[PDB]
Amino acid sequence: MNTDITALEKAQYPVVDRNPAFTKVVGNFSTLDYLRFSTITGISVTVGYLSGIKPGIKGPSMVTGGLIGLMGGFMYAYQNSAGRLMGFFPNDGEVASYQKR
Amino acid sequence: PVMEKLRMFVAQEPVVAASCLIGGVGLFLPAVVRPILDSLEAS
Amino acid sequence: MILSVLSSLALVSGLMVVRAKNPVHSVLFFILVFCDTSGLLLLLGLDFFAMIFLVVYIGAIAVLFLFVVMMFHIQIAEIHEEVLRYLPVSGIIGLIFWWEMFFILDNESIPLLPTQRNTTSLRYTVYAGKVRSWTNLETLGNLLYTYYFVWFLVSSLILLVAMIGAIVLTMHRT
Amino acid sequence: ALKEEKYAARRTILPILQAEEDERFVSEWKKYLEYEADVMKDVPGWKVGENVYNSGRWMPPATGELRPDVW
Amino acid sequence: YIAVPAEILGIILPLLLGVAFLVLAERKVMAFVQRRKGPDVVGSFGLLQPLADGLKLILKEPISPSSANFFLFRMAPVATFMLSLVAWAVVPFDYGMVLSDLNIGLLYLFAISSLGVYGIIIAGRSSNSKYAFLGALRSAAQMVSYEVSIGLILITVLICVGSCNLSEIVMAQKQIWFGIPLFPVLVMFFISCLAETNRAPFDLPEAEAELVAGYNVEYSSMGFALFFLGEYANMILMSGLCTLFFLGGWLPILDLPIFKKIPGSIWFSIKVLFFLFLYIWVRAAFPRYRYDQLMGLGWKVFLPLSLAWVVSVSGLLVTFQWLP
Amino acid sequence: LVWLEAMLPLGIIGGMLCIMGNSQYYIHKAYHGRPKHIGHDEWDVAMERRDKKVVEKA
Amino acid sequence: MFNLFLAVFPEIFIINATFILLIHGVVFSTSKKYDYPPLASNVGWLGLLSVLITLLLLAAGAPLLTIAHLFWNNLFRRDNFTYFCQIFLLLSTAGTISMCFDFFDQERFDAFEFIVLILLSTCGMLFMISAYDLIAMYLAIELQSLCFYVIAASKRKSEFSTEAGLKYLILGAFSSGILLFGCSMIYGSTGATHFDQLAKILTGYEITGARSSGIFMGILFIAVGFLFKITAVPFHMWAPDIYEGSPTPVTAFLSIAPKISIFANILRVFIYGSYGATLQQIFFFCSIASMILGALAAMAQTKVKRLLAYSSIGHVGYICIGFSCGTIEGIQSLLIGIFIYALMTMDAFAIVLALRQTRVKYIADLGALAKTNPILAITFSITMFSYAGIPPLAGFCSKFYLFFAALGCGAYFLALVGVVTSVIGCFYYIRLVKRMFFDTPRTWILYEPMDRNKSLLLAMTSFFITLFLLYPSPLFSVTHQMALSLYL
Amino acid sequence: MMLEFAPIFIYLVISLLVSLILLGVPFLFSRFDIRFYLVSILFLIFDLEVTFFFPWAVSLNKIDLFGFWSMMAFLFILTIGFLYEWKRGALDWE
Amino acid sequence: ASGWGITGNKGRCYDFWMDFSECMSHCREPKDCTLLREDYLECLHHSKEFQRRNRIYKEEQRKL
Amino acid sequence: MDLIKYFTFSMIIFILGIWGILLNRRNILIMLMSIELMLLAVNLNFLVFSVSLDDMMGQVFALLVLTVAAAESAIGLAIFVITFRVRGTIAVEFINSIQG
Amino acid sequence: GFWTFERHNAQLRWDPQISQVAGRRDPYDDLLE
C-alpha cells in the first residue's frame, strides 16, 4: 500500500516529525494530555454510573461508560500529541526537546 | 474471581470456546508474529 | 441475434412478473429474469458477476421473497384489479420513456454498421497483455479491500442495520 | 515456480509473435486504405485514413463489439 | 461441437447407471449390517433390481392430483433432477478428464447448490397439502442453513489454492492432501454435506413415522423417481467434492512410481466409493435429530467453526507468506 | 465371504465413474487430435488461431 | 500507517462506541439476574456522551481531518465546509437524543436499538457530508435511509407506525433507484464518478448544441432523488404521512438532521460541478411549487404534526430559492436558513414532545394553554411568530433573503408568490396563538410539566430566537466562510 | 475466456431432454411463522459474506496485510451483528 | 478516468484522460483543452470513427 | 451495435419496473418487486458501462449495489410482515388511514 | 478556472504514486522490468 501523510493545509508550526510512530506519539504525552484523558474517562464513568441506577446495573454501566471514555480520551490525547509533533498545533515543548536533543 | 467462569464457559460452550481459540490464533499470528518476522528480516 | 433472444425472454418474463395474478408466480418469473440477466453477463465475459447474480439474487433474495409470499396465502380478491383502464396512461408514459431513453446512447455511441467486407482482419492483437491473464474475480479482488475499502466497510454497516432491523421489527421470542 | 517457468517461456517468444502480428496488420491496413481510396473516390473533401484523434497518437481500429476477446 | 453431445451422454448415462446401483448398494450394505441379504432374487445377486424398479415406475400410472398448479407440480422434480445432473459438467476425474474447465468452477458449484432448494419448495406449495408444505419449508430452511457452512469451507480451500479451478484445486494437493492439515474441516464438510442432502441423521423427508410428512408425499411414478434420482446423484456429487477438495482428487496416496502405475480415474473412483460407503454406514448407525436440534447445530456449531477456520488458515498463511 | 455380494454394486458405481471420465477423455482427443489442455487461456487461444494460419498458409 | 487514520478519528470513535452500546444493551436487556431492565435511557445517555465526544474529537482536530488527503482522496474529501456541516449535524443529533428520555420513561419505549440505529444513521450522514464520489454518496445515503425506515416503524404494533414505515420504504426505494439510474447514466457518458473528474469534464460546455443527452438525464434523475430527499414538491407527499405516523422523536430527528446532510451533498455535487441553468430552473420551479403547496396544505391542517410537516415543506422551498440564484450570497443565505430552521424546529418539537405526555393531537387541544401554563404558551407563540417571519425574530432572515434574491435575480412572480405565501403562513401560524390565548373552551386539557432536558433546550432556543439579530455576526461570518470553501 | 460455458449450455439442453423423456413416457401406457423469514435473513447476510470472501481469498497474495485487516474489520462488524442475533434468540428454534 | 482496466492493465482511455487533466490543471480557459477533451471522449465512445466508417458504408451502398 | 442492445435490455427491465408500479395499485408486494427490477437494470448498466469503457469502477459499484439491494429487500419484507400482522390483510384499503 | 486550484488536482498528484501498481500498468513495463 502506497501511503502519503501530506495534508491539504500546511502546518503553521515547526514540524518536529512529519509522521511520528505510535509509540513516539504516546511517549510524547504531556501533563495536559493526561489531564484531558483523565477528565474524559472520569466524566464517562460518572455518566455510566448515574444513567445505570434506574435499570439496576450501575456497576456494568460504569464499566461500559469507562470503556467509551478510555477510548475517546486516548484518541483525544493521541490526536493532540501527534498534531503537536507534526506542527499542526502549537508545540513549543516538542521543539525544545528537538533543538536540545 | 474470574478464573472459574472461563472454566464453566468452556465446559458449557465447548464449540464456542474452540471457535474463539481458533480465530484468536488466526488473528494473533499476523498482528504479533508477522511484525516480529518483518523486523527480524530487516536486521 | 442471441441478444435478441435473451432480450425477448427477459421482456416476457418481466411482463409476467408485473402481470401475474398469483404473486408466487411473480416471484418465480422474477427468478427467470435473473437467469436471463446472468446469461447476458456471461456474454459480457463477467463470469463472477454472472454466478453471483445466481448466488445472491436467486439463491438468497428470491428465496426470501418466496418464503414470505408463500406463507402469506394471499387471496386474489385483495390484490386483483382490471388493468384495461391503464392502457392509455401506460401507453403515454411508456412511449415517452421509450423514445427518450432507448435512444439515449445513439447520439453519443453511434453504432458501427456491418459492411459487406471482412473488417475482422483489422483486429490488431497485442500479446503483452496476454502473457498473464487476470480473471474478473482477481481484478475485482485487487481493488475491493485496499484502494476502496471504506465503501466495503460501509456496505458491512448497511448489512448490520439490516440484521438489527429484522430482529427489532419481527422477533417474538417464545 | 512451474507457473513462472511458463510465463518466462511466454516472454522470450513474445517479440517474434508481435512482429509477425505487426506485419500482418500493416499489410491489412494498406489493403483497407486502398479499398477506402477506391470507394470514397468522387467524394469531395475526403481524406483517406484520417486520424480522428487530434493528438495524432495511433490506436487500433475500434471493432464495435463489446467483449470480442473472451470468445 | 458436433462431438460435444457424445461426451455429454458419456457423462450422463453412466451417472444414471451409477445412481441406480448406488440405491442397490445402499440396500445391500444396510442389509448386511442387519444380518439380512437385501435384493438378491431379481437378477444374480439382485443386480437387475434397479432395472425392475425403474421399469415399474415407468409403467405406474401418474396421478397428478387435482391441484391448481399442475405445471409447477410436474416441473418441480424436473428442476431438481436437471440441477443434480448439471453439476457434473465441471467435475474432473483425471488430468484432462472434464467437460468444462471452468475458471469459476467452485463458485459455479456453490450456485448450483443454492439453486437446489427450489424444487423442494415448489413441490410443497404446488402439492395442495399442508403436511407436504410444512415439510418442504423445514427441508428448505435446513438446506440453506447448511449452505453457509459449505460456502465457508469452500473459502478455506480457496485460500489454500488461490483459484476457483477444480483441476487446479486437485493439482495444489500434489505436495500434501488438504484432508491431512484440514481434517476437522473435512469432518465438518462431510456433516454439512449430509445435512445438505437431507440424509441421515438429517433426513427429515424420511421421518414419516415422526409425524413429519415429506415434501414429495403427493408424488407418484416418475416425478417421485426424479426426486429420488436427484437426491442420490447429489450424494455421489458430494462424495466427489469431498474427494476433490480434501483427498487429492485423482492423485495417488504417495508420489512413488508403484502408485503412479494405476490410472488417476481409479484413485478418484476409490475415494468417491469410500465416502459413498460412509453415507450408508452413518445411515445404518445412528438415529435422527429433530428439526430444531439440527437447525441449532447448523447455526450455532458449524457456522462459527467454519468462520474460525477461514480466519485461522488465512492468518497463518499471510503471516508466514505461504500463500499461493 | 458373503459380504462380497455388497462389493458388486459399489464396484459397478466405481466403473461408471471411470467411464464418465475416460469416455469423454477419448472422444475429445479423437476429435481434436490431442488431449484436452487444462488452463486454456487467452494466450493459448491466440496461439491456436495464429498456428492455424502458420500451418495452412505454408 | 496509523497516522493516516487521523482523518477518520471521529467516525472510528463513534462507530466503535455504537458497537459497545449494542453489546451492552443486548447483554443486559436479556439478563434474568437484572430482571430484563429497560435500557433505552441508559443507552441513550451513554450515546449522548458518545456523540459529544465525537463532536469534541472533530472540532478540536480541525486541521488533522485534512491529513493524508491524497491517500483518502478516492474515498472522501474533508474541508472547512464539511467540518462545519458535520459539527452542526452532531449538535442536532445530540439535541434530538436529549429530547427522548421522557418518551422512553413514560411511554415505556424500552428498545435501546432505537438509539443504536440513530447513531448508525448519524455515521451515515457524517459520511454523506464528506462524500466526494457518486458511489460513496449513494452508499451513505442508503445507510441513512435504511436506518430511517427501521426507526419509522419502531412502534411495530401500531397501525400508524407500520403504515408510515411501509410508505417510507416503498417511496424511498423508488427514489433511490431513480437516483442510482442517474449515477449510472453519468458514469456511462463520462467514464468517471469522482467529483473532481466530473467537474473537469463538464466545465466549459454545458449545453453547446452537441449536448450529451446521457449527462443531461443523469443530472435529471439524480436531481429527482435529491428533491425527494429534501421533501420538495412534487416529490413530497411521503413526508407528511411519514412525519405524522412515526413516533414523535423519530419525526423530530427526520425534520432536521437529514436536511443538513443532503444539502451538503447537493452543494458539493452541483455547485462544485458544471451544467446549464437547467438544474437551477429545476430547483426554482420546485421552490415555487413547494411554497404554494406547503402554505395551502398547512392552512388545511387541524393536527399539529401535519401542520409542522407542511410548514417544513414550505420552508425548504424558501431555502431552495437560495440555491437557484447561483451566487455566493445564495449559498450563504441557504446555510443561514438551514441553521435557523433547524433551531426553530428543535424548539417546536421540544414543545410538542413536552405536550405528548398528555397525548396532544389536535391544534384545538392547546385551548386555554395561556391559563394552565402561561410561560409555555408564550414560548410556543415566540416560536410561531418566528415561523411566520415577523421581525425582530430569527425567522425573519429567510423572508428577507427570499425577497432580496428575487428583486436582485430580477424575479417578480417569485416576489408575488412569496408575499401571498408569507401572508397565508402568518394566518395559519397565528391561528395557534389564537387557540392558546383567545379561545374559551368548555373542556380544558391540563398538560404534565416537561422534564429538565426539554426545558433547558427550550429556554436556550427561545433566547436564540428572540435575540439572534442583536448579535448575528458569528453565523454570518461562518456561513460566508463555508460558501467560499466550496469553490476555493 | 468464456469458451468453456458452451458445453454447459448443451449439457443443460440434453439434461432437459432426458428429464422430459422420463417424465413424459408414463403418459403413453394460513399460518405465518416468523422464524422462516428470520432464517432467510441470516442466510442472505452470510451468503453476501461468502460472496465478498471469493475475490479476497483469490487475492490474498497481492493485498497482503492491508486487505487481510480490512476483511477482518468487515467480519468484525458482521460478527457483532451475529452475536446480536444469538443473544436475541434468532438461532433457537425451540 | 480511474486507470484500472478490466483485465488488470492500464485502462484504454486513461492516457487521454490524464492529458486532458494536465491540460486543465493550468489552462484558465477550458476552451484551451477542447482538443484533448474530445480525444478522451472519442476514446470512450468511438463516435467519430464509427461515423466516418458509416459514411464509407453509405457511399459504397449508394454506388452499388 | 452491441452496446445499444445491452443498454436496451437494461432499458426494458427498468421500464417494466416503472410499469409494475403503474399497474399494481392494489398489489404492494409487486410494487416492491418492480422496485427490485429497477435496481437490477441499474446494476446491469454499471457492468455494461464498465466493460464498454474498460474501467473497473463500474464493477465495484455493482457489487456494493447488490449489497444495498439485499439489505433493502430484507427490511422491506420485514415492514411488509409487520403491516400484515397488525392488519391481518395486505389490501391497500387498510394502509390508508394517514391522509390529508 | 477553479479546476486549476491545487485542492482540485488530487488525482494528478496521487496517481503517479501508484503508476507501478499491478492492475493499472501498461503491459510493456512488465516486459522490460
Author numbering:
A (entry chain f): 1 to 101
B (entry chain b): 2 to 44
C (entry chain J): 1 to 174
D (entry chain Z): 73 to 143
E (entry chain H): 2 to 325
F (entry chain a): 3 to 60
G (entry chain N): 12 to 499
H (entry chain A): 1 to 29, 55 to 119
Task: Quote what the paper states about this structure.
In the two slightly different conformations of the supercomplex, the angular range is 6–10°. This indicates a slightly flexible arrangement of the two subcomplexes and raises the question whether the supercomplex actively induces membrane curvature or whether it adapts to a locally non-planar lipid bilayer. As seen from the matrix side, the consensus refinement structure as well as the two resolved I + III2 supercomplex conformations include an angle of 65–67° between the complex III dimer and the membrane arm of complex I. The two conformations of the supercomplex-bound form of complex I we describe in our present study are very similar and both correspond to the closed state with respect to the inter-arm angle. This angle ranges from 106° to 108° in the two conformations, and the C1-FDX subunit is present and well defined in both. At the ND6 π-bulge, the hydrogen bond chain of the hydrophilic axis is interrupted. The π-bulge is identical in both our slightly different I + III2 supercomplex conformations, presumably due to the substrate-depleted conditions during sample preparation.
